[PDB]
Amino acid sequence: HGSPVDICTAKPRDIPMNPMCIYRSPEATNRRVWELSKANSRFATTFYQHLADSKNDNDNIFLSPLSISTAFAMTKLGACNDTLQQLMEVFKFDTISEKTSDQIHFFFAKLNCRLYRSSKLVSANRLFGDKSLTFNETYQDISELVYGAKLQPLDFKENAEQSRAAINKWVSNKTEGRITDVIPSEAINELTVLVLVNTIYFKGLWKSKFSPENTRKELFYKADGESCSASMMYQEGKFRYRRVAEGTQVLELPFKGDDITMVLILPKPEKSLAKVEKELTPEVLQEWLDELEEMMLVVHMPRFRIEDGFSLKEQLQDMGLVDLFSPEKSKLPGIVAEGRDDLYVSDAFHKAFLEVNEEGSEAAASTAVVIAGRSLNPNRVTFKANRPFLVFIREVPLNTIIFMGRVANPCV
Amino acid sequence: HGSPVDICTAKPRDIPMNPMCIYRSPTNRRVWELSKANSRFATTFYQHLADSKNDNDNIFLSPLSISTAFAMTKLGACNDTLQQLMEVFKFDTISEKTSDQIHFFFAKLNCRLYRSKLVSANRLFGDKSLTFNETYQDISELVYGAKLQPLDFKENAEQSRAAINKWVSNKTEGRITDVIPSEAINELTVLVLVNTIYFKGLWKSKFSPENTRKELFYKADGESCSASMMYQEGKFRYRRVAEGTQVLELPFKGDDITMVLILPKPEKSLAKVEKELTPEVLQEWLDELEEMMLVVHMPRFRIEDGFSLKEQLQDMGLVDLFSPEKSKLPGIVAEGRDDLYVSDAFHKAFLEVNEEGSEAAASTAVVIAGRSLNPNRVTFKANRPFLVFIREVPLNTIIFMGRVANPC
Numbered sequence: 001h002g003s004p005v006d007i008c009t010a011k012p013r014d015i016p017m018n019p020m021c022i023y024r025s026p027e028a029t030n031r032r033v034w035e036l037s038k039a040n041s042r043f044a045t046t047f048y049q050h051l052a053d054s055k056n057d058n059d060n061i062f063l064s065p066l067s068i069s070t071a072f073a074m075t076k077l078g079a080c081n082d083t084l085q086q087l088m089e090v091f092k093f094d095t096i097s098e099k100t101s102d103q104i105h106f107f108f109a110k111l112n113c114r115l116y117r118s119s120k121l122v123s124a125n126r127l128f129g130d131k132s133l134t135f136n137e138t139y140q141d142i143s144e145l146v147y148g149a150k151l152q153p154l155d156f157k158e159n160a161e162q163s164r165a166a167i168n169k170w171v172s173n174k175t176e177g178r179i180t181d182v183i184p185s186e187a188i189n190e191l192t193v194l195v196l197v198n199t200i201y202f203k204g205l206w207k208s209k210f211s212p213e214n215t216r217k218e219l220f221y222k223a224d225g226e227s228c229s230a231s232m233m234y235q236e237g238k239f240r241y242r243r244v245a246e247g248t249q250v251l252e253l254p255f256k257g258d259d260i261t262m263v264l265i266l267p268k269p270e271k272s273l274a275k276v277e278k279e280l281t282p283e284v285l286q287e288w289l290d291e292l293e294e295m296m297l298v299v300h301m302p303r304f305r306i307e308d309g310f311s312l313k314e315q316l317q318d319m320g321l322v323d324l325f326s327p328e329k330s331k332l333p334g335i336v337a338e339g340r341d342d343l344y345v346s347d348a349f350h351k352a353f354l355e356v357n358e359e360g361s362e363a364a365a366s367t368a369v370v371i372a373g374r375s376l377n378p379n380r381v382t383f384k385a386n387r388p389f390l391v392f393i394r395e396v397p398l399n400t401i402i403f404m405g406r407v408a409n410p411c412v
Numbered sequence: 413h414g415s416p417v418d419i420c421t422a423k424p425r426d427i428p429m430n431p432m433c434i435y436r437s438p439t440n441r442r443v444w445e446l447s448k449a450n451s452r453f454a455t456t457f458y459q460h461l462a463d464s465k466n467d468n469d470n471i472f473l474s475p476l477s478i479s480t481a482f483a484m485t486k487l488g489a490c491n492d493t494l495q496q497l498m499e500v501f502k503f504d505t506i507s508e509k510t511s512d513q514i515h516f517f518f519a520k521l522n523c524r525l526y527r528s529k530l531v532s533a534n535r536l537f538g539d540k541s542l543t544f545n546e547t548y549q550d551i552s553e554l555v556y557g558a559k560l561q562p563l564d565f566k567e568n569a570e571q572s573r574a575a576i577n578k579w580v581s582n583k584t585e586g587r588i589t590d591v592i593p594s595e596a597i598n599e600l601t602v603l604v605l606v607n608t609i610y611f612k613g614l615w616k617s618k619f620s621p622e623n624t625r626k627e628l629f630y631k632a633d634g635e636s637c638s639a640s641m642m643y644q645e646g647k648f649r650y651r652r653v654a655e656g657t658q659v660l661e662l663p664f665k666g667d668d669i670t671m672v673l674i675l676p677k678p679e680k681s682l683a684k685v686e687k688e689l690t691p692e693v694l695q696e697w698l699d700e701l702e703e704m705m706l707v708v709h710m711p712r713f714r715i716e717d718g719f720s721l722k723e724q725l726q727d728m729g730l731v732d733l734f735s736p737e738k739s740k741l742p743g744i745v746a747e748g749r750d751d752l753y754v755s756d757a758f759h760k761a762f763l764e765v766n767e768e769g770s771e772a773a774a775s776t777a778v779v780i781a782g783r784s785l786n787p788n789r790v791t792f793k794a795n796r797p798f799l800v801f802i803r804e805v806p807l808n809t810i811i812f813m814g815r816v817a818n819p820c
């Protein structure tokens with residue numbers, strides 16, 4: 001009698017499932033799966049902000065924070081010491097009050113089971129290790145059981161570029177031809193050892209379809225004030241909506257099953273999207289969603305397609321002292337007379353001197369922090385018009401942000 | 413009737429410390445814990461600095477000085493600005509609770525440090541036309557002894573610049589003269605927080621001029637030049653650690669302040685030693701250097717360095733995972749290969765919205781590799797570039813540190 005092992009159902013009894021190292025973290029569904037979605041959502045918003053920071057407000061942005069959280073959780077499996085701790089912290093997995101890092105994989109397995117079990121929402125993970133190497137069995141086993149990531153051998157040593165073409169094809173296969181060149185040229189060479197890959201594919205139909213005979217060409221105004229032609233869709237009906245504080249709007253468009261929805265966030269005609277992006281936290285997002293009431297309204301949005309991509313190594317390691325140097329984001333309310341927070345460090349310098357001779361040595365140094373007050377120029381476009389907005393594709397019962405981004409240019 | 417409020421004496425309760433905001437982070441153990449944090453910023457920051465420079469250029473800074481100035485700047489920070497500040501400077505690793513308690517510990521440490529000559533002076537220069545918050549002003553005077561001198565930025569930037577620079581020059585015996593560059597201050601400048609640190613000690617074991625000789629020094633780019641090398645033999649704390657690195661400690665009259673020189677073995681690049689550098693590693697080396705009779709020979713030289721902190725700090729978010737040296741992934745390959753690191757990682761995404769619904773896709777690829785090679789052009793035994801640390805031993809504090817890449 002043979003029975004296929006399944007983590008969703010229960011853990012094996014003999015197959016060892018313990019990572020090589022362990023990090024003990026500080027401090028209406030499953031408490032575990034819930035707290036993990038909360039951590040994931042915390043990485044999504046935090047990462048998004050940093051991402052949006054390094055880009056031009058005229059550029060679109062689109063990513064799957066869940067996808068990223070998944071790939072690195074998979075990579076975490078073999079991490080140790082400091083590498084493991086940083087990973088735990090960077091992805092907010094350590095915000096799960098008291099819990100060893102190895103428990104994260106199982107909660108992650110419980111989440112993926114609930115997510116990928118109306119509207120198509122699939123995911124596939126895979127490991128591509130070099131054929132000449134011998135990979136650790138427990139690692140290979142945990143990866144297959146927790147993330148369903150089997151290890152496929154490739155010849156990086158002798159056939160890098162062909163191996164790359166292989167991994168890219170696999171991913172094109174798991175995303176219906178949508179993601180074709182995930183791994184760039186020269187990214188893989190004879191020194192490569194293992195490539196961990198995650199993919200997520202989603203395609204749903206509106207619970208409340210739009211009718212083609214109602215789409216119209218209209219001018220859409222970008223952040224820099226320039227305009228372009230856009231096809232705007234139109235329909236009126238009952239939709240969950242809400243006009244929050246400062247005038248921000250939140251609109252939820254659900255897909256056939258109702259458990260996956262698209263949430264649109266538009267700032268007040270006078271305020272910029274950047275104001276809404278910096279204020280974005282997982283709690284704020286939750287408050288908005290919470291206080292959403294259904295009502296008769298006219299939904300007016302552009303039909304478009306956007307493709308985006310970026311290096312995580314680059315983005316992840318550039319999260320240092322950012323706010324203090326930003327006129328918009330800097331918060332230094334304590335310095336001046338009465339809360340004046342337009343203060344920000346315009347620049348800081350350091351000078352040092354060292355002399356060593358027969359009698360001894362002399363050393364000097366000075367650090368200068370230069371704070372200045374400034375402002376943000378007014379927004380070019382103030383009149384009501386089609387402007388850029390935020391987009392989220394959520395799984396509601398699981399409180400999970402699958403996709404998210406900024407639709408800054410839905411043209412041509 | 414009147415007793416000056418002195419923090420070096422006081423206990424947490426006595427000193428009323430209330431900053432605008434607070435941050436909750438996850439028994440002189442504190443002063444100790446603070447020095448560790450500073451030391452951790454020190455190494456982290458150095459590695460990043462060394463990284464963006466040419467291995468042929470010298471490097472010299474005072475991490476303590478930067479930590480101090482930004483700690484002073486932290487007094488008026490809030491929300492995300494305050495958290496980042498707490499984290500980037502590793503203050504969030506101090507087993508405490510509220511972000512305000514570190515200014516109390518930093519004061520305790522500055523007390524022990526500044527009472528060989530080792531002094532420090534901090535001052536705030538605000539625009540005369542503005543009104544500065546009284547509490548902020550009081551706390552900066554109490555904790556860092558930073559008084560607020562008014563200057564006319566709004567009307568006389570260039571003159572005010574000259575003023576601040578002259579004060580710095582005064583507190584560093586004319587060593588640091590142009591800390592603040594031109595155009596760095598203008599009509600919109602509001603406040604300039606300045607820290608200063610000066611040190612001058614004599615060797616506990618002086619060097620004799622009659623023994624200095626010009627010797628060839630080989631730089632990182634291969635070429636060689638002449639340097640005046642000092643010579644003397646005696647008992648010094650030393651040690652030839654793992655991977656063949658040498659650590660030498662030359663103390664100053666008083667023993668409480670010392671210079672530590674770090675030299676990698678011939679076939680190892682200084683750059684690789686810089687990249688592997690961690691507070692713990694540094695500690696272990698220092699921890700048990702044995703005293704022994706040996707011939708110490710080092711160059712006599714001077715180096716002056718300066719740089720903008722914005723660029724550096726803005727990107728201080730590195731993760732060992734992307735570091736060939738520091739990455740730890742012993743669980744992937746059988747037996748435990750240590751050299752595994754993520755060479756790069758990519759994300760790609762797609763979204764299409766139309767009348768019928770929407771379609772989204774995405775992939776994340778993490779590429780792990782091993783066998784990273786650090787260029788090494790001077791692999792023979794000769795005078796080469798080394799690391800320099802000037803530390804306070806009873807307070808395990810790194811006051812100054814740098815790279816001597818060209819004493820010529």
Ligand SMILES: *[C@@H]1O[C@H](CO)[C@@H](O[C@@H]2O[C@H](CO)[C@@H](O[C@H]3O[C@H](CO)[C@@H](O)[C@H](O)[C@@H]3O)[C@H](O)[C@H]2NC(C)=O)[C@H](O)[C@H]1NC(C)=O
Nearest residue numbers: 333334336337338339429430431432433544545546547548
């Ligand atoms: C200067 O910055 C100060 C921060 O260091 C800031 O102090 C805060 O001021 C408020 C109001 O004066 C205090 O709140 C008081 O009032 C509330 C309600 O009236 C009481 O419940 C409180 O107990 C308290 O009595 C804050 O406590 C105080 N924060 C501190 C110092 O702990 C000043 O407001 C700033 N002043 C200027 C000129 O802007």
Ligand SMILES: *[C@@H]1O[C@H](CO)[C@@H](O[C@@H]2O[C@H](CO)[C@@H](O[C@H]3O[C@H](CO)[C@@H](O)[C@H](O)[C@@H]3O)[C@H](O)[C@H]2NC(C)=O)[C@H](O)[C@H]1NC(C)=O
Nearest residue numbers: 016017018019020021135136137138139743745746747748
């Ligand atoms: C593959 O990675 C494994 C981590 O998931 C790692 O597991 C460790 O394997 C060793 C065996 O060498 C276990 O040590 C055992 O042996 C002693 C004496 O026989 C026992 O007393 C111990 O309690 C233990 O059972 C480790 O405990 C085990 N680590 C854990 C926590 O699972 C393998 O070593 C790696 N294998 C290869 C090929 O590198």
Ligand SMILES: *[C@@H]1O[C@H](CO)[C@@H](O[C@@H]2O[C@H](CO)[C@@H](O)[C@H](O)[C@H]2NC(C)=O)[C@H](O)[C@H]1NC(C)=O
Nearest residue numbers: 278279281331432433434435490491492493494
């Ligand atoms: C930044 O943090 C401070 C607290 O450290 C927050 O201050 C509170 O602001 C609200 C207004 O929304 C007031 O009702 C409270 O009285 C404030 N608390 C204090 C200091 O008494 C502030 O809201 C935070 N700002 C952000 C980024 O949301």
Ligand SMILES: *[C@@H]1O[C@H](CO)[C@@H](O)[C@H](O)[C@H]1NC(C)=O
Nearest residue numbers: 020021022080081082692740
């Ligand atoms: C890394 O952690 C392991 C246990 O997880 C420990 O045995 C080892 O000494 C650590 N490595 C270091 C930092 O020396």
Ligand SMILES: *[C@@H]1O[C@H](CO)[C@@H](O)[C@H](O)[C@H]1NC(C)=O
Nearest residue numbers: 578579581582583584585586
């Ligand atoms: C620096 O300031 C002191 C007083 O604080 C003054 O006496 C001294 O002359 C100044 N330094 C010099 C010599 O310029």
